[PDB]
Design a protein around this ligand. Structure first.
Ligand SMILES: CC(=O)N[C@@H]1[C@@H](O[C@@H]2O[C@H](CO)[C@H](O)[C@H](O[C@]3(C(=O)O)C[C@H](O)[C@@H](NC(C)=O)[C@H]([C@H](O)[C@H](O)CO)O3)[C@H]2O)[C@H](O)[C@@H](CO)O[C@H]1O
Ligand SMILES: *[C@@H]1O[C@H](CO)[C@@H](O)[C@H](O)[C@H]1NC(C)=O
Ligand SMILES: *[C@@H]1O[C@H](CO)[C@@H](O)[C@H](O)[C@H]1NC(C)=O
Ligand SMILES: *[C@@H]1O[C@H](CO)[C@@H](O)[C@H](O)[C@H]1NC(C)=O
Ligand SMILES: *[C@@H]1O[C@H](CO)[C@@H](O)[C@H](O)[C@H]1NC(C)=O
Ligand SMILES: *[C@@H]1O[C@H](CO)[C@@H](O)[C@H](O)[C@H]1NC(C)=O
Ligand SMILES: *[C@@H]1O[C@H](CO)[C@@H](O)[C@H](O)[C@H]1NC(C)=O
Lengths: 329, 173, 172, 173, 325, 326
């Protein structure tokens, strides 16, 4: 009949929906999804630095120098660490690595290590070095071996274990991570055989640290065919500090140690996911995110720059309007 | 809808209007077609975009969870860590989810207000020169060519110019 | 009120209208009464209901306070625990209380918008057949039957059918 | 503007109107001026003040951080304490920042809604006794007294009293 | 004169009020209160399961086997624990239970224990087992007794106290919670009397645990007539783990121990009664029976409970502003 | 004809707020809620001055380093200020055990009264006056010792006998006290100062047990010493009793503190001036009525909430669109 002008709004083919406080499942013409739920199930280089693959070895296994862990021996630099859920090679001679959790925390933080001989075997006088071996700690080539960073010191043929002393002065600019031990025989028999007779001790100290232990002798349930135990210990020798070592007997001495470079967050992932020649900006413990989104489905645990973690399945914001296309029929 | 326009007194959208959120449909002896109102669409796009960026901006921190181990004399602080991290996870999930529900309600109201505002603008220019047909549609009581159509869309419609013609036609019917 | 209808240009509500949130009052030779708009009332009930359930749902998680014991060499982690639990307590208290203040402001406005859109829906049918007084009421320029009133509420009111009669009395 | 009035179909504000937020500008044979609608200026002030006080009140708690030291065997609890404090700090910054953006948006809408509702209160009193110019102004078709100005403002404008003078003018034109 | 139709809105006899950001005390036609401020002042069953009432015994008294605390001595199943604040029967012979707080947390987890004899008295050779009783640990029936779960081992009438030894191998599927002690005399006289002469040690070991301690003779202030002390210890023998025990004196030996089965655990310290009721949600200050989503009663609870908040009220408006004529 | 027009307020304001929809929006009225300003000084809180440790650390103060004599005796504080560069701490090298826990316990206090717990005559048969060491000079003496401890040594003739002491806490206040164990570098120094043979330090209360013996060995020289001392602290509860027993190597408690329990310990360079505050942060005083602050999360008194925001300005007025004048 007559000229029309009408006011109205865009519709479209979109079938994407959003919720509001008042209504669910509203189809809108335009929206943006703010939450990411896709990942690549792998470990990539962060800041172009490859992570450290422990492989069969555990963290204990790695830094004490389990003989089977020679693949890892010496210098390492990493953006993060990956320890496999079923690594076999850890502490092979049964005992406690004391303050272990606090050690795992320290290593995570945790950029690079340089291996080096801290106390040469000759440091200790009047004692036998060459007999510190066990069948509880084979290498892949000898049935009886021992940690590459410790010395199991035995009394010599004369049935006296002299007092031994060792000094190391840290003139470097880097903290040094180092390890030592105290042996606890199942027998007084084995005690007499391996070391002297009479009360034994292991004392150590620095400008800020003191340590004193004596052997606690007792028969214990067999582990790796050993009813005896070793107490392992760790510490960090700050720049400009000096270590003094002194033992009557039962010392498992430091031999090799680590110059330790701090970082600069750091992480330790327990996981069986593959490690590959790839780069990432965001690495979760269950995968790489490669995304623009603001929120992440995948994991609360990550190193690098990740979206914020939430339990949501979806976080889609309406940008367009309610979509009311015409029924075409 | 809350302002009553979208899916309200204007029943459906236009798949035909492809260049804008809000628009006019016209029909004249010259022709028929769809045209987005550019000013209001562009204002809405800037506003929606600022809002998305604000939300992204404010959400751009992260709580830090950690891989730390605990020994079996450390049940209490291990659980303290667990309850701490879950605690922040719950607070952030709550915020993102509640925010999206609230902003989604308001963003739809915004579109619904612009449609309504666009309709009230046109209605108040036309006055009695045009007859309301119902679904946001006006039928002119006079010839309205393309220049006159553009005139309405631009906000410069000349009610006096056509008021004699409209009145005479109105009486006739 | 913010859309201006509730406690606005419709100065008061109706104790008499019992069956609905929003409604029509009519007067005529046959009498006077109240009637709820069934559709917009239900549409509001559905919305408000969904809002209350959304809030309840989002609020489902709880933070677990524990009350472990701490020794006299654990003042720091004991204090850490307490500050932690009081921190989460403070945040959820803030969230619930502010949400309620905000949501209540908005729910009142929804009701206001709904009443407003009913008024304009009626006004738009009636046109010049009726006179819009100040207060949400329309005085007809013709005799409005109970059929006629019911058609006004239905959205099926016949404007041309009463145009002539209305023009006259509007002229008289 | 969302309701369309402020910086909208009423293009600008009045530096001349200084005793209120919203109001009226009249011109009549007896003079002209700018006078505020007191009731709706006052209600907006009570409302807005309440909003600022509710926000101040709800924000009245503090999370308290601590000077505690940790040894070199307490790296895990020490880091626990840090992530917690950063956590509550991020949560609260977020709450404050987001709330301010959201409330500012809604405060400006409230002002827009109050102007819009004043404009409608007058448009419905005057009907065809006045002519809508643009920009929120009405030109009466009849001589309007100061007293008539007040009857529009206080809401008791008497439409029939001027319906004949007005209509004779309306289309003697 | 003319017929009228009017648009409007409901009103009602409501005087219920809500607050908004813009306004306080707005009467509204319909509202919903989201917060629960009422409780039943008692302890009820949770998952159709009663709680353990310690009554007169502290947690220490109960699991060490304080002579006054049998009658708690059987097996136990619980949905949560109630320790009464003033309970007087705990550590009877003075000393420290090492890692007490961490032991309380482990017991709090878990729902049930089965008491069994881990080391029969016959385990230790060459040494007296019938004489290890004290006047600091009376039962109700006798003045000198001892913890039912431990044996205070003492020298044979004919000296000396030899190396005693014992092992236990956990073949079950459940963890074992067990206790032991080291006696610390006030004198070398008491030391020589009860034990030999000579350096005394107490050593224990498993696949993953190492313990070693020696007596520390000195006189501490008198507590329950005792200026000597006992250092008590606890541990958990995992499934498949063997415990080896070796001492040559001053051992307070493990006698009975607990098969321990591990949700949310709860140790309530309260004085409320335990009635024969059932419940969905239990808090430390009473039962919540409610559908509301917030509660202002307590942050400490077991079961399914509303979120705790400091608010007094959380009322959502659902209807509209009430302005009746 | 006559006009009536509807409109809204405008003014000369150039103050802007942000909005979810719009960034730089000029408005007619507004309230800043955040405070970014600080007086860079320490003041009294609750009309109570803070305690300035000056050149001394918490260890030096409370163990009684001789160079820390100015702080000796009773003290009442509203908070504690430890200067970062302070050099008077533990003068005779060794570990203060559970140090962080001590620093937290002391921070939770507001007052201590110093008093002799164990008179030197408590230990019979030993020399209580030979002190004394060059690792602990006072300002006037090259060889002194901690004022709250006695380094006990054997009498001019051998030998060091069993020594015993008891203190009963009759009072209503907890007592904070200290002791130590000397760890010589040589068996020679051990033999010179104490007897021969196995030495111990043992102490107990109704609720606490302690036992330690000398760990003899040479550590790196620190203030001229290759020997060490292990320092310890504890808190004797009201009604509790302390027994002490040793045959050598005891650094004995001498003087202790009756202790009266927020609390804070600020490590800072800021001057302590004669003024009053309601709020004190570690970087300054807040004199304000604002709701939020960005100065510091570390404080004492009533402070606004700490947030990382630059500004939190709330629109109260409408958008400012004033008429353009040329
Ligand atoms: C052979 C056997 O089964 N008998 C056990 C007795 O010997 C222990 O048995 C194992 C086999 O599991 C080894 O033969 C142990 O010998 C070593 C070892 O661990 O390899 C031999 C080392 O050269 C020796 N090294 C040093 C530096 O001393 C080492 C250590 O001394 C011990 O690990 C410390 O205990 O032992 C052998 O000790 C065992 O004597 C007896 C008690 O368990 O039980 C037999 O079953
Ligand atoms: C949304 O709606 C669809 C049907 O419209 C339904 O299958 C789904 O459960 C609803 N919820 C979601 C996933 O948003
Ligand atoms: C609708 O209106 C007509 C009058 O026009 C009335 O007769 C009819 O009953 C109404 N229908 C309903 C269901 O409201
Ligand atoms: C309202 O306006 C009329 C007309 O000027 C005036 O007579 C009356 O007094 C006014 N009422 C008021 C001030 O409320
Ligand atoms: C209000 O209404 C409810 C139900 O109509 C009724 O139970 C109550 O008695 C009424 N209030 C008064 C005035 O008592
Ligand atoms: C523990 O029991 C198992 C199963 O009988 C046995 O093989 C093992 O030897 C026992 N532990 C030891 C080493 O005695
Ligand atoms: C350690 O080496 C540094 C550098 O020469 C030296 O000053 C210091 O005296 C040495 N310390 C010891 C204890 O030998």
């Amino acid at each position: 009949p007559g000229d029309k002008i009408c006011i109205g709004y865009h519709a479209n083919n979109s079938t994407t929906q959003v919720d509001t406080l008042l209504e669910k499942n509203v189809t809108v013409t335009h929206s943006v999804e703010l939450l990411e739920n896709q990942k690549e199930k792998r470990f990539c280089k962060i800041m172009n630095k490859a992570p450290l693959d422990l492989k069969d070895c555990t963290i204990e296994g790695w830094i004490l120098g389990n003989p089977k862990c020679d693949l890892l021996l010496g210098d390492q630099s990493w953006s993060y660490i990956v320890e496999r859920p079923n690594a076999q090679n850890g502490i092979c001679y049964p005992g406690v690595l004391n303050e272990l959790e606090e050690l795992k925390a320290f290593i995570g933080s945790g950029e690079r290590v340089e291996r080096f001989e801290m106390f040469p075997k000759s440091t200790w006088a009047g004692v036998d070095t060459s007999r510190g071996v066990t069948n509880a700690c084979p290498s892949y080539t000898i049935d009886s071996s021992f940690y590459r960073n410790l010395v199991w010191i035995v009394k010599t043929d004369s049935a006296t274990y002299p007092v031994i002393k060792g000094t190391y002065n840290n003139t470097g600019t880097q903290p040094i991570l180092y390890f030592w031990g105290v042996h606890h025989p199942l027998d007084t028999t084995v005690q007499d055989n391996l070391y002297g007779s009479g009360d034994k001790y292991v004392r150590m100290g620095t400008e800020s640290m003191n340590f004193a232990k004596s052997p606690e002798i007792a028969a214990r349930p067999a582990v790796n065919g050993q009813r005896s135990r070793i107490d392992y210990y760790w510490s960090v020798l700050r720049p400009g500090e000096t270590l003094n070592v002194e033992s009557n007997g039962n010392l498992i001495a430091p031999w090799y140690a680590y110059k330790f470079v701090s970082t600069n967050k750091g992480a330790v992932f327990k996981s069986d996911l593959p490690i590959e020649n790839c780069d990432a900006t965001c690495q979760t413990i269950t995968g790489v995110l490669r995304t623009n989104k603001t929120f992440q489905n995948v994991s609360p645990l990550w190193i690098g720059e990740c979206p914020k973690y939430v339990k949501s399945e979806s976080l889609r914001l309406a940008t367009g309007l309610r979509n009311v296309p015409q029924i075409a029929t | 809808g809350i302002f009553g326009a979208i899916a309200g007194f204007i029943e459906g959208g236009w798949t035909g209007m492809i260049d804008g959120w809000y628009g006019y449909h016209h029909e004249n002896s010259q022709g028929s077609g769809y045209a987005a109102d550019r000013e209001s669409t562009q204002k809405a796009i800037d506003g929606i975009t600022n809002k998305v960026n604000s939300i992204i901006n404010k959400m751009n921190t992260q709580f830090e969870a950690v891989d730390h181990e605990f020994s079996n004399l450390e049940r209490r602080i291990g659980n303290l860590n667990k309850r701490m991290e879950d605690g922040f996870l719950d607070v952030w999930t709550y915020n993102a989810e509640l925010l999206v529900l609230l902003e989604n309600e308001r963003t739809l109201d915004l579109h619904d207000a612009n449609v309504k505002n666009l309709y009230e603008k046109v209605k108040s220019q036309l006055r009695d020169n045009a007859n309301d047909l119902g679904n946001g549609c006006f039928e002119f009581w006079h010839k309205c060519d393309n220049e006159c159509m553009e005139s309405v869309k631009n906000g410069t419609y000349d009610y006096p110019k056509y008021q004699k013609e409209s009145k005479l036609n109105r009486q006739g019917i």
